[PDB]
Amino acid sequence: VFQNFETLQLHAGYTPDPHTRSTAVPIYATSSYTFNDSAHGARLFGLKELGNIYSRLMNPTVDVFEKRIAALEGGIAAAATSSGQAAQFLTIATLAKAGDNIVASSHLYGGTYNQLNVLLPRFGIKTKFVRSGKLEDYAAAIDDQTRAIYVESMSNPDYVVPDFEGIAKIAHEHGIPLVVDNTLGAGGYYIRPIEHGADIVVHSATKWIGGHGTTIGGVIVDSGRFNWNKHSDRFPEMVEPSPSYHGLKYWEAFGPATFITRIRVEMLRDIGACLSPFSAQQLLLGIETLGLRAERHAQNTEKLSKYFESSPNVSWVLWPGSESHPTYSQAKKYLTRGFGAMLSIGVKGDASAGSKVVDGLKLVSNLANVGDAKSLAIHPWSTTHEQLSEDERLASGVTEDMIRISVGIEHVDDIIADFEQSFQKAYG
Amino acid sequence: VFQNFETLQLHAGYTPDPHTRSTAVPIYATSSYTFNDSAHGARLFGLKELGNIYSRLMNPTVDVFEKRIAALEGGIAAAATSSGQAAQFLTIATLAKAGDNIVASSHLYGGTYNQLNVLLPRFGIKTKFVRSGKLEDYAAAIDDQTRAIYVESMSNPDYVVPDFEGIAKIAHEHGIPLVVDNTLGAGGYYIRPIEHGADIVVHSATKWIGGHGTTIGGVIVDSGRFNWNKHSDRFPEMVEPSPSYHGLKYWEAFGPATFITRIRVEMLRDIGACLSPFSAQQLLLGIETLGLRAERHAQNTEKLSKYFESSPNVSWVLWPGSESHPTYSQAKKYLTRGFGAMLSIGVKGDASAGSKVVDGLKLVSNLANVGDAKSLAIHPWSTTHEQLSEDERLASGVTEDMIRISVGIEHVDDIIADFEQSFQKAYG
Numbered sequence: 046v047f048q049n050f051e052t053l054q055l056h057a058g059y060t061p062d063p064h065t066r067s068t069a070v071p072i073y074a075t076s077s078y079t080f081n082d083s084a085h086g087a088r089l090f091g092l093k094e095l096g097n098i099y100s101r102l103m104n105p106t107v108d109v110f111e112k113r114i115a116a117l118e119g120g121i122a123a124a125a126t127s128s129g130q131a132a133q134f135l136t137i138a139t140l141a142k143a144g145d146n147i148v149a150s151s152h153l154y155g156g157t158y159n160q161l162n163v164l165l166p167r168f169g170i171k172t173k174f175v176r177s178g179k180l181e182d183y184a185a186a187i188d189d190q191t192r193a194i195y196v197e198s199m200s201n202p203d204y205v206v207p208d209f210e211g212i213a214k215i216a217h218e219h220g221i222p223l224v225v226d227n228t229l230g231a232g233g234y235y236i237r238p239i240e241h242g243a244d245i246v247v248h249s250a251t252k253w254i255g256g257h258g259t260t261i262g263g264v265i266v267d268s269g270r271f272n273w274n275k276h277s278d279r280f281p282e283m284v285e286p287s288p289s290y291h292g293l294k295y296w297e298a299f300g301p302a303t304f305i306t307r308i309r310v311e312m313l314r315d316i317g318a319c320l321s322p323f324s325a326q327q328l329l330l331g332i333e334t335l336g337l338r339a340e341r342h343a344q345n346t347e348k349l350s351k352y353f354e355s356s357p358n359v360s361w362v363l364w365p366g367s368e369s370h371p372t373y374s375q376a377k378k379y380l381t382r383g384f385g386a387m388l389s390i391g392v393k394g395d396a397s398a399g400s401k402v403v404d405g406l407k408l409v410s411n412l413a414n415v416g417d418a419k420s421l422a423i424h425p426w427s428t429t430h431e432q433l434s435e436d437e438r439l440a441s442g443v444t445e446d447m448i449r450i451s452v453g454i455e456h457v458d459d460i461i462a463d464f465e466q467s468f469q470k471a472y473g
Numbered sequence: 474v475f476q477n478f479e480t481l482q483l484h485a486g487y488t489p490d491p492h493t494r495s496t497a498v499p500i501y502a503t504s505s506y507t508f509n510d511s512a513h514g515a516r517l518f519g520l521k522e523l524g525n526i527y528s529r530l531m532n533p534t535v536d537v538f539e540k541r542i543a544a545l546e547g548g549i550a551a552a553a554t555s556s557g558q559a560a561q562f563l564t565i566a567t568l569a570k571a572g573d574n575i576v577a578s579s580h581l582y583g584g585t586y587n588q589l590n591v592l593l594p595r596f597g598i599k600t601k602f603v604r605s606g607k608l609e610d611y612a613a614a615i616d617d618q619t620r621a622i623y624v625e626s627m628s629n630p631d632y633v634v635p636d637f638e639g640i641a642k643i644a645h646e647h648g649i650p651l652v653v654d655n656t657l658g659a660g661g662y663y664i665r666p667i668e669h670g671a672d673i674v675v676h677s678a679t680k681w682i683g684g685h686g687t688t689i690g691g692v693i694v695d696s697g698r699f700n701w702n703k704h705s706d707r708f709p710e711m712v713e714p715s716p717s718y719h720g721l722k723y724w725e726a727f728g729p730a731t732f733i734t735r736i737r738v739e740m741l742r743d744i745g746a747c748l749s750p751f752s753a754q755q756l757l758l759g760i761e762t763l764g765l766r767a768e769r770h771a772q773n774t775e776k777l778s779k780y781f782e783s784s785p786n787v788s789w790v791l792w793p794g795s796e797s798h799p800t801y802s803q804a805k806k807y808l809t810r811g812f813g814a815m816l817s818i819g820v821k822g823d824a825s826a827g828s829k830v831v832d833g834l835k836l837v838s839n840l841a842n843v844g845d846a847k848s849l850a851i852h853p854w855s856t857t858h859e860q861l862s863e864d865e866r867l868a869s870g871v872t873e874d875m876i877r878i879s880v881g882i883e884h885v886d887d888i889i890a891d892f893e894q895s896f897q898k899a900y901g
């Protein structure tokens with residue numbers, strides 16, 4: 046047992062196996078695992094014994110990655126997926142089925158919005174979007190078919206910080222879990238939603254968790270704290286005999302691990318959005334420095350917001366740590382280890398000034414990603430949120446003059462100098 | 474243009490890029506691809522220009538994998554998935570939505586059956602199973618909500634070969650595509666369903682395509698031969714303005730590549746079951762020997778069926794090249810380059826005779842996989858088909874005494890000798 050993020054990110058969930066004593070995690074580039082005998086195979090498939098069967102469901106490299114992220118977020122267990130989008134999809138598909146709905150903040154990553162608003166309705170799963178952040182609107186949107194409340198721990202790219210505890214209380218009084226996308230909380234370093242009532246946490250490990258922009262992946266973290274038996278009227282599949290496994294009852298067999306066990310033995314087994322062990326190993330190398338990177342990211346982001354605030358060329362600065370931020374009181378309560386790695390800005394001049402400043406950058410990179418160690422910038426109105434209508438973009442805090450900046454871990458003087466010379470060129 | 478499988482498996486879909494001139498396919502371990510300028514990023518996201526955006530959707534290593542398989546199967550294009558299960562799920566989820574159904578053969582790999590019988594119904598998508606293989610029963614099952622016919626080119630694990638041409642006509646005359654799971658066809662080497670009417674081909678690339686049991690992966694191959702416009706009454710999303718892309722009309726923009734385009738810009742984008750480049754490079758190493766391996770696999774299987782036919786300890790041999798096989802007339806018609814890499818057997822003795830024989834093998838491995846270069850054996854009643862009810866296993870051809878054998882490319886004498894010594898320990 047360790048308390049400290051900086052120790053867990055190096056040590057949790059792995060012990061050198063006695064056979065090789067390998068200090069680093071091996072890459073188990075295998076699809077299969079040989080049975081000891083026929084009866085052993087029968088027990089593994091019959092869920093009468095834990096053990097490796099097939100890498101669509103489990104892999105010892107992926108397993109270290111799952112346990113470590115679980116330990117950092119404070120959950121009991123995790124399941125890795127092939128992407129952050131798949132982490133969201135498998136979660137929602139386990140909680141809900143045709144005829145159900147979920148309640149969700151309207152401030153979302155554009156891919157999430159399109160998934161909730163376009164894809165899932167094809168399967169009879171609808172989403173009601175709440176724009177205000179007000180507790181009473183979240184409560185009003187819930188009905189008898191609702192199966193979750195869904196929010197981002199810091200919305201991409203306007204950085205709304207939700208009232209985690211208030212929203213969790215509403216969810217729990219209605220008998221539904223709170224699902225938090227904690228991607229912008231950097232693996233639990235900036236924000237730890239399970240400590241504030243979240244029942245399930247999903248991540249795009251592609252971002253800060255991975256940290257180096259090499260690898261797509263996602264992960265689903267189960268708090269173990271939602272009582273599926275007590276709320277079985279909304280979730281009968283969690284307690285009733287399972288058609289997939291000859292009347293197996295998940296709650297009776299697995300208890301607090303019921304949700305994440307279903308994710309694995311039903312959803313990964315049948316949807317098949319599994320993570321490669323090569324990908325897991327790249328994510329593990331990033332996790333080994335997650336706290337150090339997230340610490341420098343937030344320091345650079347703070348200094349860079351100061352420079353932007355006093356710049357004659359900057360119209361506005363959106364940074365969650367600012368006392369003029371619309372949700373500063375939530376940010377102050379929940380972000381006590383740095384106010385994130387992100388800021389957005391609007392620049393002065395005509396409609397083409399935003400592109401001229403980005404295109405003039407020579408150190409910052411213009412691409413679709415966040416949470417690289419390299420500094421990035423993009424115009425989300427035309428990119429990450431392009432699929433939404435203009436009204437849905439504005440309802441998500443995405444404006445047409447906004448430049449989203451993912452602040453890297455380069456020396457902050459070089460980042461500042463890069464904008465400062467790009468400003469000279471577009472203005473004077 | 475090359476004709477020959479043996480040449481395509483080494484050359485199709487890749488030319489050394491002029492910058493590095495790398496003869497082998499590089500591993501593009503990157504999440505992102507830097508824009509030339511802001512306008513370029515907007516053109517990419519707007520689907521106005523072809524180009525790398527983000528590895529959840531596209532990756533140059535994965536692109537070679539996709540093009541090479543499409544060329545080997547005779548399709549216009551392909552999309553990779555994280556697993557064979559994901560390939561099937563994304564395909565059906567694009568053809569069907571809540572309220573729709575598909576018609577499928579009852580002779581299915583157990584995970585596919587569970588997908589169709591248990592998972593997809595939760596999304597309002599039901600499956601009607603046909604047990605007889607009779608053209609009339611396939612036709613009687615279709616109704617106005619049907620969206621495809623689904624068959625395996627050689628069913629796992631009784632090796633029923635369908636009447637491809639007859640079934641493809643039933644599908645096309647009712648306005649629906651024939652979707653064929655060609656996993657046991659070995660990437661098109663043994664069977665090329667598109668030559669016999671199939672519109673969409675799915676593989677588990679985990680099997681013979683990869684050929685070394687290192688990597689999970691899937692692929693979807695579009696023939697480009699199904700007129701979505703002519704059948705827009707059953708598939709309106711193929712022609713009607715798309716809510717994901719501001720009214721874009723897919724058929725009008727992409728024509729015969731419409732289905733495979735939606736797989737990428739809708740399903741891989743939103744479900745996110747993508748393949749990593751490390752996985753793709755492993756599978757490309759497989760594909761470079763696929764014809765050589767499949768040829769040796771089938772030579773060994775033929776000789777091994779001969780050995781089993783004349784063994785006193787064997788009760789029955791099930792091999793699609795046998796003139797006694799139930800669908801031998803289909804097999805003789807569609808399998809002209811070797812009768813596959815699989816056989817099944819039942820052994821004399823009590824209930825525990827099959828386990829005695831498998832457990833006594835020292836060269837053949839007892840595990841869950843087919844299509845490894847190493848020879849494999851398993852008991853599908855308690856493993857790959859365990860989730861099915863007894864009646865469902867029997868209607869898929871699976872019985873309790875069945876030993877499924879994936880014949881490897883070891884020297885056939887060592888394979889035979891392995892069975893001999895296990896036969897002598899268990900039968901005196």
Ligand SMILES: *[C@@H](N[C@@H](C=C)C(=O)O)c1c(COP(=O)(O)O)cnc(C)c1O
Binds near residue numbers: 558582841
């Ligand atoms: C292969 N399924 C194997 C399970 C270990 C087996 O031993 O048969 C398979 C699949 C699933 O593909 P993934 O395992 O998700 O890549 C799909 N269709 C067929 C016909 C298979 O054999």
Ligand SMILES: C/C=C(/N=C/c1c(COP(=O)(O)O)cnc(C)c1O)C(=O)O
Binds near residue numbers: 128130
């Ligand atoms: C290019 C994509 C970026 N976003 C990703 C993302 C995902 C989706 O996660 P995968 O990309 O599927 O791993 C989920 N949740 C959040 C808050 C995200 O930011 C981007 O914003 O620029």
